[PDB]
Each structure stands twice: as C-alpha cells, then as structure tokens.
Amino acid sequence: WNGKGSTVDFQEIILRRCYTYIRVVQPELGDRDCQKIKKAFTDAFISKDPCSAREEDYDLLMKLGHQTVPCDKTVFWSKTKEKGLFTLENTLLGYIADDLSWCGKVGSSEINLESCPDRRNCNSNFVSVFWNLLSKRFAENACGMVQVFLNGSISNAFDKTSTFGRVEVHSLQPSKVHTLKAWVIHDSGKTPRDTCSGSSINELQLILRGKNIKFTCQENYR
C-alpha cells in the first residue's frame, strides 16, 4: 500500500500512553482500565482486511474510552495543526492514538509494519475510520461555546473538504452548542491570504446560521 506501515511496538505504545493519561494528564479519569482499552483497540483491526474498516468495529473502544469534556472548552484546529482546553488530541482516545499508524492483515495475529492503505488507497482503512469517528463524537458531545482556529495565511482557511468542514461542523448539536467562534491567525510577517471577510469563512457562517447557531470571527497575529 501507499500508507505508513503500523507503528512498531504499537501495542506497548498505546498501553503506556493510556496510563500516563489517566494518572497524570486527567487524573479525573483514573477509574478507567488501560489494558481493557488496548485490547479493544487491537481487537478492532487485528487480523482483518485493512480496507474493510467500519465505524462499528470501534464501538467497544468508543464505549471504554468515552469522556465528555467541559463546555466552552471544546476547540478545533483546521490545517493550522502545524491550556486546560480540549482539542481532539487532548482527549483520552485522541491522546494515545495521536501520530500512530495501524492496520491488520487477514490470517495474521499481528500488525502489519510493511504498509497500510491510506485514505486514497481506500477510505475505509482503520486509521481514517478511527479519526473520522473520534471527530464526529467529539463534535456531538460539544456544549456551550466552541472554537476553531484557522490559518489566515492560506487562500481558504475554512475548507469544506477537511474533517472540520465536512464532518465536525455538521455534527455540532444546536441544542447543546449556541455559539461557535472562529479565530483566523495572521503572521505579522505577511499580508492575509484569507480573512474573516472572505468567502471561505462566509461558507462556515452560512452552515451555522442554518441551525440558528451564533457565529463570530476574529483575526489575531500573536
């Protein structure tokens, strides 16, 4: 395949990360069991066709790793990726899986280090489905005021094809989320390629006004 092979020692890595999370990152959740989680993660894809992944294969995992973050604390970053606030990667599941690569193989009781199909090889691969589902859940459990950081140095800070624009924004619950604030970051070093007054951000605004959800956009250098 074209995608990265599984991360070596994948099992050990997620086991470690998980504990470090429930005893230090958010002691708030020391009640959870890491070995149980690791088993579910692995059971979800091991020895399976790497292009047959379904959201359902992660039910067990999403159940054992569920966690609702404080309202007003939910934050989104769209392609700007490069305190006491939760972004998808700061949650339990996003935390341990972050930056890792994984996929099984029919007939194999282990991970495939050689290669894994990426989204362009097949959309239904285990890494994409995972992240796609995590994002969906993260957006559905958002309450109060949500935020999203966009890059003012690119032509279209708000992309309708990104995870945020095609998945997350639409999964926000109007009944739980009343306002969405967008921050367009600008480098004092260059002029804005896109601003709050652009058509890209207007596309986001229309999405939100359709659901009567309040929207605001501000520009920051920092």
Q: Which of 103, 143, 196, 217 is catalytic?
A: 143
Task: Tell me if 113 sits within 8 A of 5, measured CB to CB.
Answer: yes
Cα dihedral across residues 181, 27, 67, 79: positive or negative: positive
Tracing tokens 């994002």 back to the chain, one arrives at: 135
> Are 136 and 61 members of one domain?
yes
Task: Tell me if 159 sits within 8 A of 136, measured CB to CB.
Answer: no
Question: Which residues partner with 182 through β-bridges?
Answer: 148, 217
Tell me the residue range of the domain where 187 lies.
Answer: 68-86+142-222
Q: What CA–CA distance (Å, rounded) separates 155 from 10?
A: 37
> Are 134 and 183 members of one domain?
no
- Which amino acid makes up residue 151? N
- Final residue before a domain boundary, out of 120, 141, 162: 141
147: CATH: 3.40.50.720
- Final residue before a domain boundary, out of 117, 141, 165: 141
> Are 107 and 160 members of one domain?
no
Q: What CA–CA distance (Å, rounded) separates 105 from 98?
A: 22
Q: How many domains does the chain have?
A: 2
Q: What CA–CA distance (Å, rounded) separates 161 from 158?
A: 9
Q: What CA–CA distance (Å, rounded) separates 127 from 9?
A: 16
> Are 134 and 152 members of one domain?
no
Q: In terms of Cα–Cα distance, which of 217, 154, 157 is closest to 182?
A: 217
Active site (annotated) includes residue 217? no
Q: Which of 71, 116, 122, 217 is catalytic?
A: 71
Q: Give me 192's structure tokens.
A: 């804005």
57 contacts: CB under 8 Å, gap ≥ 6: 44, 45, 48, 126, 129
Q: What CA–CA distance (Å, rounded) separates 200 from 212?
A: 19
Q: What CA–CA distance (Å, rounded) separates 78 from 62?
A: 23
Resolution given for this structure, in angstroms:
2.3
> Are 93 and 7 members of one domain?
yes
Q: What CA–CA distance (Å, rounded) separates 1 from 115?
A: 6
Residue 197: left if φ>0, alpha if ψ -120 to 50, beta else—which one? alpha
- Which amino acid makes up residue 27? P
Active site (annotated) includes residue 103? no
C-alpha dihedral, 62 to 174 to 201 to 135, nearest 10°: 0
127 contacts: CB under 8 Å, gap ≥ 6: 3, 101, 102, 103, 116, 118
